[PDB]
């Protein structure tokens, strides 16, 4: 296949928890924050995939791993800033009451470049929190979206099997000053919430992140001290055998 | 005239390793997706996980992740069930059947669903643990 | 992961008796459930999937039904050859068995 206790916050699309890659590791909590619904993918497709991606006990990349799911996208994929800003703020909350040291939070999302929504990320950034995001699928210069755009949030880029800028639909990976790192998100095989022995395989931006997300994991495992700068150099490095 | 042929009995002091092979054989085609199933003497049924060729990964049971390994000779038609840390509990006969990884991918997608329908034994290998 | 439980352990009947074994699924499986027959000394043997439809070449005396939980494995008029040991297995899943039902001549 191509491609000390940490916490893993994904913020996403409901996911399918009993899904044998992940039952019994990940914790869904109760946030939920979506829109009402405005076209062939189940309702939790996008986020049982990316909790498999990361934790999946014989796909992931960290096959740990701790994971807790909120929920902020609806059946279609789509959420708003809002809600994510709130589910942000859950996360701050059970830093506070419940630690623990280090936590790393995947937003396999985009929307158009927002102040709130990178001010919030920033403010968590201060508490020490690893933030994770997508550059986006748009062939766009990834500082005209957030999350992306948010320096103090890690801004991962989508690279195919011949490390090369991954191509989607007519459009493809972000790129540009304010992408951080690249990372596999072509064909990544993962849990499918068609069935509970379902895998497929996905691309794009969130896959990527949710690679870098895995690593970050790891990494804080084994070295649960790092600094949000040591991490990053560390994750750069990696990244790289050229 | 399809079939699946094990190698044979093992005798094991405990806290060693056992590899079993799984040998498939006259269709037109015998690289399958193996699962492997213990019946320790006089008890009932246990997976233990199984190997996909076509996702390319392996999928282990929560009871066994950590001491079983499970794979394939690309070259041979034949899939390996590798127990290690052997003790007594693990006396059992230690059978292969072939699972399907069926594609029921739309639009598509690369779905793979692996459907766990063990129509194709496995003669068995009586795997004995005991100092 | 899922567990199964089946009933009875055990079943005396005679040829042409109607026996039915019932299994248990620890939560909704749709219809993903297999039942095998066992020999002394033999792999199990495929008779039903899905709940209800028949292996290849299985004779139509076995039936299946059941859907969500609780299921039945039917033996409509027994043979000879059916006594032995019969059990349920879920693939919704990760595979997981019933403890077996044993089919015993009635005597």
């Known amino acids: 296949p191509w491609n000390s206790l940490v916490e893993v916050y994904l913020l996403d699309t409901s996911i399918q928890s009993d899904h044998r890659e992940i039952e019994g590791r990940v914790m869904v909590t109760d946030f939920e924050n979506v829109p009402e619904e405005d076209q062939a993918s189940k309702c939790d497709s996008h986020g049982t995939h990316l909790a498999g991606v990361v934790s999946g006990r014989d796909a992931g990349v960290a096959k740990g791993a701790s994971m807790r799911s909120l929920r902020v996208l609806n059946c279609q994929g789509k959420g708003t800033v809002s809600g994510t800003l709130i589910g942000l703020e859950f996360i701050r909350k059970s830093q506070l009451v419940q630690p623990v040291g280090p936590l790393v939070v995947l937003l396999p999302l985009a929307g158009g470049y927002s102040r709130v929504l990178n001010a919030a990320c920033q403010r968590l950034a201060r508490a020490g929190v690893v933030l994770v995001t997508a550059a986006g699928n748009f062939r766009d210069d990834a500082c005209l979206y957030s999350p992306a755009s948010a320096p103090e949030v890690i801004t991962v880029g989508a690279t195919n099997a011949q490390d090369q800028p991954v191509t989607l639909g007519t459009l493809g990976t972000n790129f540009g000053r304010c992408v951080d790192l690249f990372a596999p998100g072509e064909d990544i095989i993962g849990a499918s919430s068609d069935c509970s022995t379902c895998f497929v395989s996905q691309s794009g931006t969130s896959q990527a992140a949710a690679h870098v997300a895995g690593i970050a994991a790891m990494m804080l495992s084994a070295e649960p001290e790092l600094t949000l700068a040591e991490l990053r150099q560390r994750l750069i490095l990696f990244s790289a055998k050229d | 005239q399809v079939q699946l042929v094990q190698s044979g009995a093992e005798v094991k002091k405990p806290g060693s390793s056992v590899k079993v092979s799984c040998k498939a054989s006259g269709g037109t085609f015998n690289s399958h997706a193996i699962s492997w199933v213990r019946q320790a003497p006089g008890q009932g049924l246990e997976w233990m996980g199984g190997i996909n060729p076509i996702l390319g990964i392996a999928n282990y049971a929560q009871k066994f992740q950590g001491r079983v390994t499970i794979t394939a000779d690309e070259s041979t038609s034949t899939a390996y069930m590798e127990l290690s840390s052997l003790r007594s509990e693990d006396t059992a006969v230690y059978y292969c059947?072939?699972?399907?990884?069926?594609?029921?991918?739309?639009?598509?997608?690369?779905?793979?669903?692996?459907?766990?329908?063990?129509?194709?034994w496995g003669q068995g290998t009586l795997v004995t643990v005991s100092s | 992961d899922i567990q199964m439980t089946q009933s009875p352990s055990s079943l005396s009947a005679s040829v042409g008796d109607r026996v039915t074994i019932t299994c248990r699924a620890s939560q909704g499986i749709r219809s993903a459930l297999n039942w095998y027959q066992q020999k002394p000394g033999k792999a199990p043997k495929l008779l039903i999937y899905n709940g209800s439809t028949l292996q290849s070449g299985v004779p139509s005396r076995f039936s299946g039904s059941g859907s969500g939980t609780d299921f039945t494995l039917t033996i409509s008029s027994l043979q000879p050859e059916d006594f032995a040991v019969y059990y349920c297995q879920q693939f919704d899943g990760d595979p997981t068995f019933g403890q077996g039902t044993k089919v015993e001549i009635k005597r």
């Open positions: 059947a072939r699972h399907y990884e069926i594609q029921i991918g739309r639009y598509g997608m690369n779905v793979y669903y692996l459907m766990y329908r063990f129509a194709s």
